[PDB]
Amino acid sequence: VRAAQVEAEEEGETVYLTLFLEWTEPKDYRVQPHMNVVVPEGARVEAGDKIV
Amino acid sequence: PLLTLEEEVELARKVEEGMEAIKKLSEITGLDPDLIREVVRAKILGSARVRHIPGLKETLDPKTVEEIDQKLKSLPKEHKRYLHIAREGEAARQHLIEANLRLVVSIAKKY
DNA sequence: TATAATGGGAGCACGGATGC
DSSP: EEEEEEEEEEEEEEEEEEEEOOOOOOOOOOOTOOOOOOSSOOOOOTTTTOOO | EEEEEEEHHHHHHHHHHHHHHHHHHHHHHHHOOOHHHHHHHHHHHOOTTTTTTTOOOOOOOHHHHHHHHHHHTSSSSSHHHHHHHHHHHHHHHHHHHHHHHHHHHHHHHOO
């Protein structure tokens, strides 16, 4: 995970960071022999787009 | 070499989708499914085998298959897609047959 | 017209042009 933007607000002796974070969460999909992959390596997909 | 289940299914799939793509090209081009099929097959196999087909209304020669190939390549991208599908379909057909050639021997030896 | 099946089967002789 990486922090794109960092906002800081001071209260008392402490600082409160509002962070804008961007990261990637993996999900595995098991492909059975009767299934074929319609997507290449490193391709970008959206909501609704067919993978296998 | 013999086909793994995955490989077999793949080739069969490419064949079916291929035939469908030939039908689609028949719809778009307004041409004959047979003529298109013969042209695609001719390009996959090469100029080595070119001959007149009994069902075709037109004699099949390098000239005609060239004109038809050019009328196919003159299609828009999304339409030209089905041409590629068809080509790879014919190739898959060839490999499927060539792979299943042993079954024929094992059956025929009993006759 | 669809379970899956995938590599065969059998069975003397001498003379002369060639071929490695």
